[PDB]
Amino acid sequence: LICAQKFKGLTVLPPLLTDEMIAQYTSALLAGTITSGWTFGAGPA
């Protein structure tokens, strides 16, 4: 339980990139792979 161990000085810091931003990065990479292929990694899509 998080609120049984947090009372001893332990604190869980939230990550910088949330799940939504990681999902957006994943969707962008998938769209670039499907539409462009390998061109969006070297230069323009």
């Binding site: 947090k6 604190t11 810091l13 939230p14």
Partner: peptide, 29 residues
């Protein structure tokens, strides 16, 4: 959080883990 003493002296405080209702303000996760 400070932009650096070389450019400004303004600072911002962040209380990591509270709801900021027992102490501009912007409630974050």
């Amino acid at each position: 959080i400070t932009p650096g003493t070389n450019t400004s002296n303004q600072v911002a405080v962040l209380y990591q883990g509270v709801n900021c209702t027992e102490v501009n303000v912007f409630q974050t996760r």
